[PDB]
Amino acid sequence: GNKICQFKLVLLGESKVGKSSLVLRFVKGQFHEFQESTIGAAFLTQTVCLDDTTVKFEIWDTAGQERYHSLAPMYYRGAQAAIVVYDITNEESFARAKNWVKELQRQASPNIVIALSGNKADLANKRAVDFQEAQSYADDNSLLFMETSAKTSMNVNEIFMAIAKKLPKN
Numbered sequence: 001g002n003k004i005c006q007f008k009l010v011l012l013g014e015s016k017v018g019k020s021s022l023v024l025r026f027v028k029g030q031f032h033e034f035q036e037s038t039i040g041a042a043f044l045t046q047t048v049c050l051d052d053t054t055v056k057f058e059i060w061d062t063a064g065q066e067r068y069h070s071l072a073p074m075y076y077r078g079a080q081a082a083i084v085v086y087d088i089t090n091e092e093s094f095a096r097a098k099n100w101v102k103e104l105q106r107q108a109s110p111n112i113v114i115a116l117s118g119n120k121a122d123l124a125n126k127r128a129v130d131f132q133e134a135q136s137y138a139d140d141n142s143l144l145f146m147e148t149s150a151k152t153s154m155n156v157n158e159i160f161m162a163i164a165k166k167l168p169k170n
């Protein structure tokens with residue numbers, strides 16, 4: 001196909017859940033076991049093939065530490081999509097993700113597509129957040145949910161592609 005679309009996407013979530021790892025896996029096909037905490041935000045782009053459309057993603061990978069919370073609006077303000085990420089081995093991170101979801105639903109664009117990533121799914125032997133519970137939460141709040149693993153690549157390309165498919169392309 002010859003159609004070309006571009007969308008702004010932002011990732012939000014508690015520090016250490018794997019936001020930078022998810023983006024690097026999607027964008028560069030890389031995974032760094034020793035990835036350092038982000039300062040403020042990092043920016044990356046990736047283009048994918050979606051049927052007859054070439055979709056370019058402008059991605060804002062925000063720093064999750066609470067001291068950067070006040071900068072969040074700068075990154076999600078004009079976002080057409082967001083991925084709120086939590087760590088399936090950390091219930092605290094899951095609760096924090098729900099609060100990010102609430103903030104987006106109240107302050108970001110009203111038509112924003114919000115996906116929920118239950119990351120570090122490769123660490124299921126240390127699971128603290130039930131898959132079905134997370135699925136129910138996501139269903140009740142109209143969020144696109146998938147458990148993912150930046151480490152193995154499980155559902156990484158899939159969650160970004162699922163978002164691309166749901167964004168307006170006429």
Ligand SMILES: Nc1nc2c(ncn2[C@@H]2O[C@H](COP(=O)(O)OP(=O)(O)NP(=O)(O)O)[C@@H](O)[C@H]2O)c(=O)[nH]1
Nearest residue numbers: 015016017018019020021033037038064120150151
């Ligand atoms: N086992 C596993 N480890 C992961 C996964 N994703 C990230 N990690 C690890 O978790 C740690 C934190 O990842 P990182 O991507 O830096 O997290 P972040 O959400 O960007 N942190 P911040 O918000 O502070 O920038 C890293 O050591 C990374 O290797 C995953 O899917 N599985």
Ligand SMILES: [Mg+2]
Nearest residue numbers: 019020037038
């Ligand atoms: Mg980071």
